[PDB]
Ligand binder design. Sequence first.
Ligand SMILES: CC1(C)NC(=O)c2ccc(-n3c(=O)[nH]c4ncccc43)cc2N1Cc1ccccc1
Length: 336
Amino acid sequence: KLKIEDFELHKMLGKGSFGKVFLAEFKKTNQFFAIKALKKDVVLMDDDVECTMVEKRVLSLAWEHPFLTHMFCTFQTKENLFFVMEYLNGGDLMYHIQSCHKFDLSRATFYAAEIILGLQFLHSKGIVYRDLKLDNILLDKDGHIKIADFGMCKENMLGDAKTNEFCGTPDYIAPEILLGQKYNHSVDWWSFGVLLYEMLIGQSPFHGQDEEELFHSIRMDNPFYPRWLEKEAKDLLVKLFVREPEKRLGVRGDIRQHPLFREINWEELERKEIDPPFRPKVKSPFDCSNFDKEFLNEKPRLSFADRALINSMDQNMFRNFSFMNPGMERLISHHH
Ligand SMILES: CC1(C)NC(=O)c2ccc(-n3c(=O)[nH]c4ncccc43)cc2N1Cc1ccccc1
């Protein structure tokens, strides 16, 4: 059944190391999705085969939480891998922070709280996310956050479990990773600190002209807190930037009880009953104005694959990639 030709790719919303993401409409219907498309030859030579399977598995768990990107289905062809996602048109936080430089206190506080809920959900399932960054936070049409890109996750991290892979995005990487220590969900709470600092202050807490200097900064320096910064925001950041992971808030104590969040009813937040302080400007369900124009101007196209590599690799590499949720299956079979 399902094929890429069943969709119309109206726009390319973005491209990069994650592949291409298109605004797609299923056949006739008035139903839109974001399709992430990957070339199998590229995934293979980037050594991303397992990350791609992790992403698929973690996304099967994610429909259970409001603050993670929901996947409807996943399918493959000899050359391509496709994730058919929920279309989210509020725009990403990196894109939004570019024009205003930094988020006002209430907006940042709100984003931080929703991100806490998403992260804690992932942790309670034994998933360490490991790539928390501003680029990976999307907004829905109403301004609620959605965490995207689960390819870096480590699964099975419940109990007395640790893992040891060096990974992340350099500005956000935890000092225990830099020091080559076995680690758990602690690493996500450092990254969260970095992300919050960026939201409030408009630049990264650690700096260097090359990675060597940056990693030194992450390991050794105290973050700068400007005098204008709200004391409870500073205090939360101080408690996240603890280098001993077992003493870090999120690992220890109860981050939900931090005074920065004293006005938040977490149960209401989780049911999306608290209005986001920032409402994206959206004119329709297909409006794509909250995305970078650099990408929107490109004609949607899937590129060719290296046949020699495709023909020579074991296709079983992507066994069990395919997955379809009941609601999607209904839509397909209705227009069959
Ligand atoms: C985190 C990142 C960079 N990596 C991904 O693998 C990714 C996967 C799915 C979605 N994604 C999604 O799941 N629903 C989306 N709706 C609209 C747009 C993107 C939607 C977004 C993703 N992005 C960010 C992005 C991509 C392209 C354009 C705007 C932002």
